[model samples]
Target: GPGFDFAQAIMKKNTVVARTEKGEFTMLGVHDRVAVIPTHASVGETIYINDVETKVLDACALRDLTDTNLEITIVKLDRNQKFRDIRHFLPRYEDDYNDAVLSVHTSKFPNMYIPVGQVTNYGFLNLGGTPTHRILMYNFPTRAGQCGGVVTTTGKVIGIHVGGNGAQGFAAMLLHSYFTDTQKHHHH
Candidate 1:
């Protein structure tokens, strides 16, 4: 029994649609870092992964939080007893990106959609820095939520969807340390 379809696999696991009070947006679920756009995150607000229902236990923007000053956000889901079984619906975290990234888009459905652009940058002088990497996508649009999940051609995730405009959201670098740090130290 080894008849797995390649096309089905690609379309199925990469990106997902998330519903918040603001609206529907594409969420990058790779890297064990399942999160939606921070601007849309609200404490006690409900978030649905496509048709599947989920809860937002806590949410915070790193830039506004104390101690460290990193322009990022992390929304922790309610891992309470109620949502144990459906936890499998979440996408696994993966960080494997290089020169280019894949920007997956959606219309009405966030789960299944089409590829809007292939982002690549040839001119990067001092892009990489501590906690943040300036990802200047050459061909990709800087629209909100559209640039989410700058994935690799191999289907691995590289950065979070920070909108093009500095006001909306920016593509923040994925730092596994942040995830671990948050776990050990819960920010209030």
Candidate 2:
């Protein structure tokens, strides 16, 4: 449209599921892993939609039913993506995901000596796009200054930025994770 900046292209994702007194709790927080719960604090032209409840697995596919009669090639996941129980789990820790995780820097990633979601910050993958939204995160290829900065590992969020490396390589460096979900699913 003609109105957007989402702080520099949308960026707001905090997780750990939470809502209600008897209808929410898909949690995972200590220091935190993805904690941003805000649907409004100020900023809206007109448009609202909220309905989230996750924990759906089963989409693993594999083939080759005759590789040497069959040694391995049996992967399947589709029990209706089993995980349906805690429905409508909506919550995203407001304040623009704590201001993009305080802009990152505290010590953690590969221990670049520490920083980046060190205490916690799940706005990586799982909170990004789909595919279970995947995310774990890690970085610090010998930490120097942190390029493009974004990194996340096991959870899945690996872009590129530090120095630079792209062999048609999707991305991995900055925050190392699809450029942090293309900057939290940018919208501007």
Candidate 3:
């Protein structure tokens, strides 16, 4: 069972709807003005956050700790559109035994928060050409519209939903590095 406090601690306000040229997807706010989205969900340079148009600051696709192809796009919104509260990244090593809860938004459900599953195993996925290394695998069922949702256990984001055959996500450690790296490049 999942903890009620854990669910309550999740910032539902931080979950936003991102409208891209391709389509609409769920994105999570990791910084006051920065939101993380799936590269596949993001089409053009411009995206609408909760219907407020914003600019795409950075985008990257890389192999995650599991060797699976993980892609993320970083978007920045103005102060007016900035999130009042943001999600903090939790290192994977820190929550190896924690139960994960997913907070996502779909066209039908504005906010869908529930305990999905835990880090059951690490297996290879060959979604693309070559098979990737050990990827995070969850036993929970995933929905189509929950692609960019946040994965948390200890009230801190540990991964971003990628939604594979079962369920997969881009680990927080990798996400943290990307966000920090992009922020540095833009600051310079």
Candidate 4:
């Protein structure tokens, strides 16, 4: 289908496998010189993506979800590095029932797992009264090493797989906010 092409292109270009002493996890290229991975997946300050070592510049966490917390670690890559072509954060309110794909990494040669699913729910509440803290719940089948980007068929990144027996993720809005804020803090 037409949408499948978009998803495949994104899988090939935006997704990368991050390897550290801890283990291997999926990472997504959100900017030309920056990538993102789940904090739990990150080990030391240095990580290897596509066998090229990079540095973990910063990280942020959202600990409101029940039973589990979500976090995103920002990695700085070479200036010449390339990332996803259309990197947009899907608006929080518009994140329900949309067809999307979760791109992850496999152990073997193919090395990719792209699952088609839907954003079944939005605005998942946390334990406390933290109204500002919300997450996305999707139906994608996720595994231990499958924490990666969740992108809509139209190419907007909606979330990153965090945790849940079912499939829960941290909204891309959180990543955008943290990345921008961290960049500003570094510049100043």
Candidate 5:
């Protein structure tokens, strides 16, 4: 339902007002925030986007943590208690978050703009190498603390929840058979 709305605003093909550190610029499509340069992202900065309904693809693979690399599995855990790999599952409790202590990373979040309809596979590209595949999801402006969030283009789901590293977030294809069973068939 959050995906594209036709009767609501007439498609939002018109331009919207936007300003940035560089200068003032007009944004196409819907009125939303965008990020052009990750390093230079400031208040009122315009995000350079090409198409309105552009599909994003993200690579969802195993979490490479030392010898503790988390493998991509078909199984999904609704909560920490249901996690099959207790050794790899690390949940963030409310007390673990230190909001009082502000840090440089605390201000911004790491995001990854994954195109819709990406693939998730456990097969290895190279037989001798580790097995992994990419998933699709979109994070408008990535920073940190942006994991486990739904990646939608215009209120529509592109994939299901998958884990990723700090810089990247993983997602399974929204149309995947297994994904429908797990995520109640959410799609754009």
Candidate 6:
């Protein structure tokens, strides 16, 4: 029973939402960084979340389904856009959510949804014949309207929902580290 509190989880998710630019807005649990989201959401468009809108500064689109199918997208938010305090979010590391039981928090289900899962595997999947490394999970939520959601463990974010298609109808974990690594040079 050493897990995150339900109410506390909800409070943390106040900053988590679906970026206008489709899919759930992937909060990378970092500051001054772009939010990761489902690729199909939008490109060169305005990202709207938490009643706030920011231009899609950049994008790492889904890998071509053949060469790869990274169903996730990374986007940079505009500087002027207002965001919640950084403490409300999780850290890139020190999250300790690597192998811990996880929860999903999203604007749709702000209360936090407990998905039956364990961090058991990490590898790649042939998503429509695209080969992309995947952070595998099991017993994740299959409820309708749950794709592109955020998966967290003990109040720390683990990854975003990948719609479970190439993911056995479950979610594929897209860690923030990857984005942070690429965008570090671009950061102020």
Q: What C-alpha lDDT values do all the predictions have?
A: 0.43, 0.21, 0.60, 0.56, 0.26, 0.52
Candidate 5 vs 6: which has more TM-score: 6
What's the ranking of the predictions by TM-score, best on top? 3, 4, 6, 1, 5, 2
Clashing pairs in 6: 18-25, 19-25, 22-41, 164-169, 164-170
Q: RMSD in angstroms, all models?
A: 7.7, 18.2, 4.0, 5.0, 18.5, 5.3
Residue by residue across 1-188, what tens digits does model 3's lDDT show?
Answer: 66545544554666778888767777777666777776566456667777777766544545566546555556666546556444344453433535777777656557777676666435454543545443455677676777776777665566666646644443322234555533334431
lDDT of 3 at 171: 30
The clash numbers for all candidates, in the given order, read 9, 44, 1, 0, 23, 5
Instruction: State candidate 4's TM-score.
Output: 0.69
Those runs of model 6 whose alpha carbons end farther than 4 Å from true positions after fitting are 6-14, 19-29, 62-67, 79-107, 126-132, 165-169, 181-188
Overall local distance difference test of candidate 4: 0.56
lDDT of 4 by residue, 1-188 (tens): 22566656666777777787867766667766677666666456677877778665544344543634545556676536667544455343444646666665535423443545556545544422333334666665555666555454564566666665544443433334544433334431
- Output the number of the lDDT-best candidate: 3
TM-score of each: 0.54, 0.15, 0.74, 0.69, 0.25, 0.64
**Which scores greater on lDDT, model 3 or model 5?**
3
Worst 10 residues of 1 by lDDT: 82-91
Tens digits of per-residue lDDT for model 5 on 54-149? Answer: 211211233333422233322211111211211111112111111110111111322222232322332222211433333442332333342222
What lDDT, from 0 to 1, does candidate 5 have?
0.26
Candidate 3: pairs in clash: 66-134
lDDT of 2 by residue, 41-89 (tens): 1112211112233322211111122311100111112122222211122
Candidates, ranked, lDDT: 3, 4, 6, 1, 5, 2
lDDT for each residue of candidate 1 in 20-136, tens digit (9 for 90 to 100) = 665656655433434545342332456776546777666666642334323345566653322212123222442323444334445553432323244443212221242333332
Off by over 4 Å in 4: 57-70, 78-80, 89-94, 109-116, 122-133, 166-188
Backbone clashes in model 3:
1
Q: What is the lDDT of residue 135 in candidate 1?
A: 35
